[PDB]
Design a protein around this ligand. Structure first.
Ligand SMILES: CCCC(=O)CC(=O)N[C@H]1CCOC1=O
Ligand SMILES: CCCC(=O)CC(=O)N[C@H]1CCOC1=O
Lengths: 240, 238
């Protein structure tokens, strides 16, 4: 069983690498969640921007009654399952003590039929945090162990979100920034604190064009000034 | 039986209290895998034009000195994520086609075979673990188990080094107050000092004092560099 995991990995990588539809990824998440005796799955992504109220997108086969309930009560703001501080090796076991500061969410979950669950998370190249949760409606498997699950989940989180990025799904995709290589170079220098006057000296071009590219750079994102553009670029790693 | 290796390593690294213990454990694990030398390198996300790079290795002092003198960090393919797949890289001749001088100097100093694993850290820093041997003896391992074994080693060692605030992995220190970071978040949204003053209901003078004080402890020209560095390291959305 040490070997059939390694091959499982290789099929999985190949499956996910060559998937051409978003609905195929979620399909595979669902297939695997079932093979592992979980009824419900949930794939959640926290974006790095906007800095003040960053967007959160999700996809789940949860009972819609609970989804509607979950949103209505604003449970996202207090769900420990979406807090990386609570994880270990990117893994998290649901238990009663975990919901010590969010009692309303936990019993409400019990009431809707979510008794046991597990969550895996990782960070993506666009700096967005992705969270995959599994849940079942039978009391079971409290002490998991279960190292193969963690590893199975480790992979299922990564490649699905990796597949979804290749497919430009907005659940995972950050704001589009197709900049000329020259335009991006000026940004690296803007983030270093250089004035258009100062940037002009080093790159040997007119200050008229520096100011021109900046506004053109701001066009394709529609930001007020050079500061927001640099920060969005830096927050996503486009500039490094 | 591997899962037991996984679990022991996790226990080891979680209970480490010292940096030399992290580097010692790396040294052992590299040697159990029939590798002589290890090298742990970290490229920080900032500054944007000349990003900071620190490393720690048990390479021969002679080779390390030569490597630095010829400025090989600037052209090392082993430190270029584009050459990786699933975060893994086996060293081969074609890899150094655009850095033959490095490869030739490396062979001359006794580095015959090697392999590298990398990941991104929570501060967006890129960590690189390399193993290398002077033997080949071209060797026997299921590459899949190696990749997985190395994946754990890169991760847990650097996370351990972060708990210990080791200088190799800790970014330039930026201890900002919760108030200071609120102002940064708003600066990053493109807000002027006046608008931040209204939103937080404090004087533009205190906005500016906080603004100048953050620039003091970072040695920054203006508020733009401070905001971008903060965004680039995740100080704002940790
Ligand atoms: C839309 C669901 C939000 C999540 O993706 C996180 C999650 O699944 N949390 C669990 C915890 C208990 O109830 C949940 O929904
Ligand atoms: C300590 C030297 C810089 C590195 O950490 C990267 C590295 O391991 N480079 C290998 C590859 C060939 O030359 C080396 O020493």
């Amino acid at each position: 069983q040490d070997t059939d995991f390694f091959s499982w990995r290789r099929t999985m990588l190949l499956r996910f690498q060559r998937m051409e539809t978003a609905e195929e990824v979620y399909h595979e998440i669902e297939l695997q969640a079932q093979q592992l005796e979980y009824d419900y799955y949930s794939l959640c992504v926290r974006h790095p921007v906007p800095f003040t109220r960053p967007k959160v997108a999700f996809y789940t086969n949860y009972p819609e009654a609970w989804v509607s309930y979950y949103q209505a009560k604003n449970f996202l703001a207090i769900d420990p399952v979406l807090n990386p501080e609570n994880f270990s090796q990117g893994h998290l076991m649901w238990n009663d003590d975990l919901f010590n500061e969010a009692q309303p969410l936990w019993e409400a979950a019990r009431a809707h039929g979510l008794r046991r669950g597990v969550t895996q998370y990782l960070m993506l190249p666009n700096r967005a945090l992705g969270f995959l949760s599994f849940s079942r409606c039978s009391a079971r498997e409290i002490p998991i162990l279960s190292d193969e699950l963690q590893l199975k989940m480790q992979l299922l989180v990564r490649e699905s979100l990796m597949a979804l990025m290749r497919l430009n799904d907005e659940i995972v995709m950050t704001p589009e920034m197709n900049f000329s290589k020259r335009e991006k170079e000026i940004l690296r220098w803007t983030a270093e604190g250089k004035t258009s006057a100062e940037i002009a000296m080093i790159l040997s071009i007119s200050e008229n064009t520096v100011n021109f590219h900046q506004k053109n750079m701001q066009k394709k994102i529609n930001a007020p000034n050079k500061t927001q553009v640099a920060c969005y670029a830096a927050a996503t790693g486009l500039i490094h």
